A paper describes a structure:
The structure of [name] T6PP bound to Mg2+ was determined at 3.0 Å resolution (residues 63–491). Electron density was not observed for residues 1–62 and SDS-PAGE analysis of dissolved crystals revealed that this region was not lost during crystallization. Thus, we conclude that residues 1–62 are probably disordered and are not required for stability or catalytic activity. In [name] T6PP, the cap was found to be in an open orientation relative to the core, though the crystal contacts were consistent with stabilization of the protein in this conformation and the protein may exist in alternate conformations in solution. Notably, the [name] T6PP has a slightly more open conformation than the orthologous T. acidophilum enzyme. In T6PP, an intramolecular interaction occurs at the interface between the first and third α-helices of the MIT-like domain and the C1-loop of the HAD core domain, leaving the solvent-exposed interface between the second and third helices free to make intermolecular interactions with other proteins. Although the cap-open, unliganded form was observed in the structure, site-directed mutagenesis coupled with substrate and inhibition kinetics identified five residues important for catalysis and/or substrate affinity.
Here, we describe the structure of [name] (T6PP) from [name]. This enzyme is essential to the organism; deletion of the gene encoding T6PP results in toxic accumulation of trehalose 6-phosphate. The synthase catalyzes the condensation of glucose 6-phosphate and UDP-glucose, forming trehalose 6-phosphate, and T6PP catalyzes phosphoryl transfer to water, forming trehalose. The overall T6PP structure consists of a three-helix bundle N-terminal domain (residues 63–157) connected via a short linker (residues 158–205) to the Rossmann-fold catalytic core domain (residues 206–292; 398–492) and the α,β-fold cap domain (residues 293–397), which together comprise the HADSF phosphatase structure.
Residue numbers in the entry: 63 to 110, 115 to 319, 323 to 366, 371 to 491
Write the structure that this text describes.
């Protein structure tokens, strides 16, 4: 019921998720002990309606809705898999996957009604098909770049338990390996704990290449490369030191675990001090913020600022060119043997305004030539992506990531399995 039991539960489970996905991609067998770990995390997360956790001196309510639905979906998926696997025990996983109706499983959970899901799905399939066709045209597989939060994954109320379900990890890995010469993922958060490498159910050294800090740090092929590109070397190491006195401090009661939960990025520390609506007892919020400037010591080079109600940042500029996702993308593609310039298609998937520099970059290099799936936002954003490219026949708007997941799964069933 406590914090560390929540964290530890979610993380051991997530590691198990990774193992399951491994079994599922590599043709190994699926232990019912694994699945059962999943099952138990699920049935605890619903017992005593969304649940609250505690230390000693503090207690806080936490929305576990995403964690729950993640687990739930995964369980009905995996069940379908295993009962088709129980015989024939040697049937290739992908074929079994083509027998499992993922569409109906995901086309329960969502904001519109079903028929919307259906049609967005149909459209998205069609779209993706056009992309694949790129490779029949140019004799090179195309490039795939995607945002994570909101885009490949539903939003989670807290960053630490933001956890990728199995089905999406599988579909994504398969899609990327089969259809693409490059698949990059750009996130705002850091790489490891708790970064996106820890949050993912996916291979990480395979066909998908994961980044964080908006492209400032990548995981490849086996290590982590980090582009500072700002004055200094000073408070890169200081941000490291501060992030330390923070590891130091969450020992105490307080709770790491709120909206973004103390992320160390390359250029900055970004910190949840408060939630929506109001939780975390504004007194304790204030005391902890001054624990934050406590640790912040010269007056050390780095600078505070209350970005918002709920969040806050410790920033290191000097310096910057003001790095965005476009730059992350370009740095990546150039680092490899490649270019967005090449003839063929680029598919980009995004959710907020932050993904637009990525489209700008893409069309700058390849105007013919770029595809975008955005999820699911307002007239303004829809209109903006329509703007930053041409038609509008190259734009696809869907309301949730599961539409993309189902479409991909379909495309895999059709082109891979026949
Ligand atoms: Mg996002």
């Amino acid at each position: 019921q406590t914090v560390d039991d929540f964290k530890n539960l979610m993380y051991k489970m997530q590691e198990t998720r990774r193992a399951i996905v491994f079994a599922l991609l590599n043709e190994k067998d699926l232990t019912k002990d694994d699945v059962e770990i999943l099952k138990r995390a699920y049935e605890k997360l619903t017992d005593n309606f969304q649940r609250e956790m505690c230390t000693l001196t503090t207690k806080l309510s936490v929305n576990i809705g995403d964690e729950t639905r993640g687990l739930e979906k995964d369980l009905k998926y995996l069940d379908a898999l295993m009962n088709i696997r129980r015989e024939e025990p040697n049937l290739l996983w992908p074929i079994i996957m083509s027998r499992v109706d993922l569409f109906s499983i995901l086309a329960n959970y969502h904001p519109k009604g079903k028929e919307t899901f259906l049609k967005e799905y149909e459209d998205t399939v069609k779209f993706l098909k056009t992309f694949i066709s790129s490779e029949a045209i140019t004799g090179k597989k195309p490039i795939f770049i995607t945002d994570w939060d909101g885009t490949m994954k539903d939003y989670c109320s807290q960053y630490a338990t933001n956890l990728q379900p199995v089905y999406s990890a599988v579909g994504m890995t398969r899609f990327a390996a089969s259809f693409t010469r490059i698949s990059a993922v750009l996130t705002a958060g850091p790489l490891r704990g708790p970064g996106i490498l820890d949050l993912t159910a996916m291979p990480i050294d395979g066909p998908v290449m994961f980044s964080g800090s908006w492209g400032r740090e990548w995981w490849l092929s086996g290590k982590r490369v980090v582009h500072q590109d700002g004055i200094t070397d000073e408070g890169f190491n200081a941000l490291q030191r501060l992030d330390d006195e923070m590891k130091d401090l969450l020992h105490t009661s307080p709770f790491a675990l709120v909206g973004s939960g103390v992320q160390r990025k390359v250029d900055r520390l970004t910190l949840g001090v408060q939630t929506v609506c109001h939780h975390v007892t504004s007194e304790l919020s204030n005391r902890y913020q001054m624990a934050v400037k406590e640790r912040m010591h010269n007056s050390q080079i780095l600078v505070f600022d209350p970005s918002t109600e709920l969040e806050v940042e410790v920033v290191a500029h000097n310096s910057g060119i003001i790095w965005n996702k476009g730059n992350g993308v370009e740095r990546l593609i150039k680092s490899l043997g490649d270019s967005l310039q090449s003839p063929g298609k680029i598919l980009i998937c995004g959710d907020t305004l932050s993904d637009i520099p990525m489209v700008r970059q893409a069309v700058k290099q390849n105007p013919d030539g770029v595809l975008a799936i955005f999820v699911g936002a307002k007239m303004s954003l829809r209109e903006e992506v329509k703007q930053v490219i041409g038609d509008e026949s190259r734009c696809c708007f869907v309301s949730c990531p599961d539409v993309i997941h189902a479409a991909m799964s379909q495309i895999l069933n059709e082109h891979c399995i026949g």
